[PDB]
Design a protein around this ligand. Structure first.
Ligand SMILES: C[C@@H]1CCN[C@@H]1C(=O)NCCCC[C@@H](N)C(=O)OP(=O)(O)OC[C@@H]1O[C@@H](n2cnc3c(N)ncnc32)[C@H](O)[C@H]1O
Ligand SMILES: C[C@@H]1CCN[C@@H]1C(=O)NCCCC[C@@H](N)C(=O)OP(=O)(O)OC[C@@H]1O[C@@H](n2cnc3c(N)ncnc32)[C@H](O)[C@H]1O
Lengths: 260, 260
């Protein structure tokens, strides 16, 4: 008669945000299987782009067009960078590799190094961004991924104000068509942050520098910056119930179940 | 009088492929510093794209345009995938994470899974590609990186011939403007390979399936495929002497020293 919890989980795997009893499980599953097969057929026939790759390209274009230098820095980083970030909490979340390296939990340490290095070469202000993989061991799975993709943009020198920071965030999310509000918060590493919220979901943490951590990185200039999770952005944009639908995955492709 | 070996190493750091005694070290270094600062100034003023990101976008466009589905699969993969790949040599090169996961040394295991899964949804033949980070512990540094970027494209079903494989490789490298020759070789995992060579540098290993390893992955169809290192491609394209100039790096940006 009624659907079992397991059957309901199965159908929810196959259900897409835009799909609209007493039909049996077998027929409801058959219908959804058919719809999802067609969705993949249509991607494959027409656009062929992965949502995560595509979102990366669109964001890349956005920040390049606005004068930010595209960075591609190591994903595998020295463990010393974690301790020099003031992280000794987030520390139980570090995936260690060999005795000396770890998978980066954020883009900040490498970007600090780039800011200092490029200050010797580039005119004020220095505007840079990176998009790439980051890793944190996470107890949750609703809004948290162990393997995720962060965007971090930043500016150092002139014009490093809270206004300009907010303006960039605003232009950015309006460009992407993502609703948001900016609330003042704090964290252990940075501040004093600004959190960019979608309802109760954190899209970004942002900071207006300087902060005292800067000195450890040879930075003695005003700066502003923000990190965004690309999977969180996709989750909002596509109305995905679970963030796993927006991840690097063998179970979902563009939020469509691959288990068909 | 003459330059010391250390001074020569310093200048070679600052030397670009296109730059053309008895001038002292200080003046030669000063000149190169000036040229490299201007190179970064010109990137920053004009294009602002990272060579590795840009190469990824151009390759992405190439394979999308030719009917291949863009994949973004996990970088952190189960250790079981390594053993199911027939790897028990390359095994000392695996960067292990936790007791159960590793950093992927190749794209093949995840793409095998995608081929099988998508066969239930997509018409014959199934054409897919991924571009992303791969990791191998490496004794060398001339043509080898521990952290690199692989392109792997493949097709399964109809038209999985050596001719079509060679044709795609040929169209691809001619598109990129990279000189090559295709030699028959072999490896422990696959074959029987075709190696795509630039002089003595391996750009790619390629395979015409089926092979007996397929059965472990639920694959029972003809297939063809090739993996290319993006850093190797950049190394050839830009005439870089060391592959570290083409890597994710805090020491080089688009093959320009960041230590200025
Ligand atoms: C570069 C300069 C010099 C140093 N720092 C400067 C800067 O530009 N800005 C300071 C603020 C950058 C934010 C960054 N350090 C950071 O790690 O903040 P988090 O809030 O911890 O990470 C940003 C978050 O990425 C996403 N994210 C987080 N963990 C997950 C998860 N496990 N699953 C999926 N998504 C997640 C989440 O969407 C977004 O809130
Ligand atoms: C997906 C289907 C199902 C399974 N396999 C199929 C397929 O499409 N093709 C089989 C052939 C794919 C090749 C892949 N399995 C492989 O790992 O071959 P390798 O020769 O070991 O890696 C390809 C190499 O990537 C680059 N590369 C390697 N190690 C490094 C390094 N340490 N530093 C920098 N660059 C490097 C190098 O340019 C290029 O020769």
């Amino acid at each position: 008669p009624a659907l079992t919890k397991s059957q309901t989980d199965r159908l929810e795997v196959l259900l897409n945000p835009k799909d609209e009893s007493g039909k049996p499980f077998r027929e409801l599953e058959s219908e959804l299987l058919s719809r999802r097969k067609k969705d993949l057929q249509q991607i494959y026939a027409e656009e062929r782009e992965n949502y995560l790759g595509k979102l990366e390209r669109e964001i890349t274009r956005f920040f390049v067009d606005r004068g930010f230098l595209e960075i591609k820095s190591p994903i595998l980083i020295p463990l010393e960078y974690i301790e020099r970030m003031g992280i000794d909490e987030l520390s139980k979340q570090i995936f260690r590799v060999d005795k000396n390296f770890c998978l980066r939990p954020m883009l900040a340490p490498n970007l600090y190094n780039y800011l200092r290095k490029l200050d010797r070469a580039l005119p004020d202000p220095i505007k840079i961004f990176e998009i790439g993989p980051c890793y944190r061991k996470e107890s949750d799975g609703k809004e948290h991924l162990e393997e995720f993709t962060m965007l971090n943009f930043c500016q150092m020198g002139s014009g490093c104000t809270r206004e300009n920071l907010e303006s960039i965030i605003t232009d950015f999310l309006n460009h992407l068509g993502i609703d948001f509000k900016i609330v003042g918060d704090s964290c252990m590493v940075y501040g004093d942050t600004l959190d960019v919220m979608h309802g109760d979901l954190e899209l970004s943490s942002a900071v207006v520098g300087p902060i005292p951590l800067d000195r450890e990185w040879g930075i003695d200039k005003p700066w502003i910056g923000a990190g965004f999770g690309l999977e969180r952005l996709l989750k909002v944009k596509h109305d995905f119930k679970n963030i796993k639908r927006a991840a690097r995955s063998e179970s979902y492709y563009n939020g469509i179940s691959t288990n068909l």
